[model samples]
Target: APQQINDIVHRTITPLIEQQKIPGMAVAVIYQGKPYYFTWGYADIAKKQPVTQQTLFELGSVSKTFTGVLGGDAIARGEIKLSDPTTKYWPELTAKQWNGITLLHLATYTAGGLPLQVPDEVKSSSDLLRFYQNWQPAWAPGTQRLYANSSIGLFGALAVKPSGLSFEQAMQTRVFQPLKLNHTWINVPPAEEKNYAWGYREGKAVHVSPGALDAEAYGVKSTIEDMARWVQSNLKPLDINEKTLQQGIQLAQSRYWQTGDMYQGLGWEMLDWPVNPDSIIIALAARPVKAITPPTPAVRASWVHKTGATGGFGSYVAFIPEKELGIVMLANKNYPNPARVDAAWQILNALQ
Candidate 1:
C-alpha cells in the first residue's frame, strides 16, 4: 500500500516540480481516514535541505479557511451572526457609504469590490479603518464576488473580536486546539523556525512580508502532516469533541453564493461533484466574475477547494466530503494556481 501510494504521488508531482522549477514540496492525501504523505526537492536549495513532513510552508489565503472556521465558530457560539452589519463589529465603518453591508458579504467576498490587496499606504489598523471610512463601493454588496484579501481580512478580524485575544491567539485557542492542529501558526515561533521552508520567487529566496490585515488574511504557515489532519477534520468534523467547532465546519462549507460554474462557501470555492482539473482552473481564474444574488441555502454534492500563495510559497487544499477524499499540495515556489489544481486533481483521482 505504501509503495502504491508513493507511485501515485510520484507520477503526479515529478513533472510538476520539474516544469515549475519548484525548490521543494510536501504533498499529502487522505483516503478512507488513512493518510499518505510524500515530500521532494529542497527546502533550501543552497543548503540542500530536503523537504519533510514537518517542513512548514506558508499557507497564504488557505489561511482564510481557518479564518472562515473561526467566523463559523463565532457564529455557532452565538457571539455573532452572519447577518450582522460590519458597523456592529467596528463602529468606525458607520459611514452612510457602509450601509447595508453585512458580515456575510465580507465573508463571501461580495462586499462591493474591495481590492485584491489593501492599499500600500494603509499600514496599520487605524490606517485601514481610515481607508474604509473613506472608501466607496464600485458595485452593490452581495451582487458580485470581488475576491479581495481586504474583504475576508476584515471579516476575520471582526469575527473573532469578541474573544478579547489577538487574531493569532484567537485562532490558536479556538480553531487550532479544537481541530487538533499542532504545527499551524499565524506567527510561527522561534523554536520551530528550523522547520520553516524558504520560498522561491523567480529563483530568488523570499517569504511573506508584513501587510495590512496580513495575519487575518494570508499569514498562516503549516506542515504537511498538520494540513493533512486539517483535511481529515473537514471530512469528518463530527469526530471533533467540541460541538460548536463541529457546527462551525458545517457552516463554513454551506453554500453562500454562486458565480458562473463556481459556488462560494465561507472560505472555500465549491464546484460540482466529479470535477475536472480544468473546471477548477476556470472557476478560479483571476478575472472578475459576477455573483448570482440571493444565494441558495442548501449544500450539494460538491468538490470544495481553496488555493493560497505568498511571494515565496504556493499551497492548495481540496476535498470531497462525501467521499472522504482530499489532497494537500505545498511548494516553496509561487507557481501558477492552474498547475497546483491540475497536480492535486490527478493525485486525488488516483485514490478514487
Candidate 2:
C-alpha cells in the first residue's frame, strides 16, 4: 500500500543527498485528499538541527508566480487594470518600456526586452528611476519576451500603488490572509527564523539577502507546510477570496500566453499533462527564440509548474489540477531546474 510510495520516494531522493554534502531538503506530495511529507538532511548542518515541514527557504523566481498571482488578485478586485501602463504608477518614469507596456506584459516577462536583472549601478528606488531616465526598449513592448526581474519588480510596486500599502502589506492583506497561508513571507518572519533553513553554496553557508529592487521578482521565502496549503488552494480553492472578489487561484492558473509548446499562466508555467519527460525538459528549458507573436493560449493545462532558486536555496512547485496531484521540493542547495522537473515528473507518475 502506502509503503510503496515511501519506498519510491527514498529511491528518488537518497541518491541525490548521497551525491553531495547537502544541508537539507523537504518534499510534500498531495494525493487523494492526503498530503504526504518527508524531510531529509539538516536545517543547520553544522549543528545537525533537523529540518521540519515548517522550514523556510528562499523561493527565488518561483516568487515570480506569487507576484503574478497577486497581480491577478488585484485585477479581480478591480483595483488595477492589466492594460494599465507602468507610467500610471510612476508617472515620472517614462520610456518605451514604460509607454505601451502593461501589467500583463510585466507579469509575463514580455516587457520589451528588459534585462533579467536590475543593473548593479542602480541600488535603490531613486537609482532605478534615474537609470530609466534614458531607458529604451530593445524590442517593441509586448512583442519580445525575455525574463526580467525589473518588469515584475515594477509590476509589484504598481500593484500596491492604488491600495496605499507596500507590496508586503498588500500581499498580507490581499493574498495570504485570504488564502490562510500563515507561514509564507517575503522575509521569513523573525519568529520563524529558528526554523529557517540556511542555504549553502560552494560548500559554505551563505545567507543571500534581498534583491536589488522590489520583493516581487525573486524574494519570497516559504515553508513546505505553507506550500502544501498553497497547492491545496489551487487544487480546490477556499471561499476566502470569492467571498469578496474573484478567486485569485483560478485567475492565476488560467492560461494567459502561448509560446511554442509552453502555456504561460499569469505567474505559473503550464504544460498539458500525459506528455513525456522530454516535453517537460523542453518546457522548463525553453526561451523565446524570437517573439513568435504570443498565440491564443493553447487549451488550459493539466500540468502547471514554477521553479525558484537563489545562490544557495532552490525550490520547485508543480501540480496537475485535474488529478489533484501536486508536489513541493525545498532544498538548501540550488540544484538544476531540469533535474527537478525530471525528478518531480517521475515522482508524480509513481504517486498518481
Off by over 4 Å in 1: 282-300
- What is the Cα-based TM-score of model 1? 0.95
| Poorest 10 consecutive residues by lDDT, candidate 1 | 282-291
| lDDT, candidate 1, 1-352, per-residue tens | 4776788889989999899888899999888787898899999888888999999999999999989988989999998999999999998776787888999989988878877888888897789888888878887777777788999999998998887888888889988987778888888899998888999988888879888999988999999999999998888888988988888888888777776678888888888888788878832233344554555442546788999999999999998887888899999998899889888888878877
TM-score of each: 0.95, 0.91
* Model 1: residue 223 alpha-carbon error in angstroms: 0.2
Estimate the overall C-alpha local distance difference test score of candidate 1.
0.86
Q: Clashing residue pairs, candidate 1? A: none
The segments of candidate 2 whose C-alpha lies over 4 angstroms from its true place after superposition are 238-246, 282-301
Name the TM-score of candidate 2.
0.91
Give a tens-digit lDDT track for model 2, residues 69-188.
Answer: 788778777788877877887798755457777777777777767667788778877888887666677777666567677777778878878888888998888777777778888866
Candidate 2 structure lDDT: 0.76
lDDT score, candidate 1, position 246: 84
